[PDB]
Design a protein around this ligand. Sequence first.
Ligand SMILES: [Cl-]
Ligand SMILES: [Cl-]
Ligand code: NA
Ligand code: NA
Ligand code: NA
Lengths: 221, 219
Amino acid sequence: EGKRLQLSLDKLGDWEKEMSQVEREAEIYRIKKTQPMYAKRRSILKEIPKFWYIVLAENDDFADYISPDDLKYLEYIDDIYVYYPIVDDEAGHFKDFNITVTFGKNPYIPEQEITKKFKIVIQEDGDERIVSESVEVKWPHELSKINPSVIKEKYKGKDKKDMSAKDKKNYRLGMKSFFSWFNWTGEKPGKEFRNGEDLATLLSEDLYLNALKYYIIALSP
Amino acid sequence: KDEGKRLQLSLDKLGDWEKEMSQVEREAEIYRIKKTQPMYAKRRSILKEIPKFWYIVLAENDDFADYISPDDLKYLEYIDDIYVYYPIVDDEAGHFKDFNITVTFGKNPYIPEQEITKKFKIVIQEDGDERIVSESVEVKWPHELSKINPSVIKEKYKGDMSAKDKKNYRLGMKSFFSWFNWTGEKPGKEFRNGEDLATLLSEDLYLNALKYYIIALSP
Ligand SMILES: [Cl-]
Ligand SMILES: [Cl-]
Ligand code: NA
Ligand code: NA
Ligand code: NA
């Protein structure tokens, strides 16, 4: 009669759950097979001088997210790498990803290696959301005047609006800088780096994957 | 020239890496297809239980109705099963993207019961690219449309058509049932955008059929 529709729908629900597990396993297999190839690519790209600076400076999508003054320091990036921790952990979300930016030896920004981790959280309304943890970054020396962290420690607990005009201008400039993106979490809206999740996806899925193409375009007529 | 030769060497390494990476991605996708096809077989067995599931999915979808003549929809009421099979699983036939679509017609007075399986293959274009082609498959048309069947009219004038027969040829080439005669190597003279309809039936409507069904049965 009509209970057959209900039984078929229950079978479909169980099938959809099993299908989700199967697709997850297949995607994790692909990530595990593809991560070592990108490790090899990282090793090769470290040979090419100023590769990532050229890729980033040519890109307009990237230039929207950063201030023009920041670009000068991005010249001293030796490596951008994306690692999917599902290869090792195999216990969380398979789309979680970590972006590592390494700055080499230069007089303008101290040499360092910054690894920022991003996780996927399912919002109550169905969709996927990117969140992150703040990672400490050694800012360029010339930009220490606009570091929001220094100004925020100077105005500890004092009113959000009772800052000096100079300090407010520098705080806004520093929140517009690329280097405050490392303090982006996604759970303090209006108070963090603007559109941090979009920049994360840009660095992990378009520039990183197609970096060779953007480089070749940047060195062609 | 200190860095020119090393840049060229790095680019050669990157090219070798790109070739190996393409091979790896092909292997991973073949694994995904092999692991996912049996699940879609189980889903086909379950969906054959649900009455007029595919009619609801096809009729509610606006993307699908654009590719066909509206009158064809009347007959799509009597579709009980649509299936997609990727032959890379068993034989490594050709390109791993080859796929076969099977449409089954249930019990109805208007079009004879049948099962039509149309096979699509991928051809590597001379400039590196891929192209979709297929082989013509004979189909038992609904009775009412035999007057406009392009094969019937083409055989009548096997020698410049009459106005009625030319108009019916135009009407039938726009019909859904001439899509089974699509090959992809006769441009301007075949069914329009057959590859797009094939991809829509194989990768959007078929994969997400449950979602479109529930949407079709909601306010
Ligand atoms: Cl990936
Ligand atoms: Cl990925
Ligand atoms: Na139409
Ligand atoms: Na899907
Ligand atoms: Na509706």
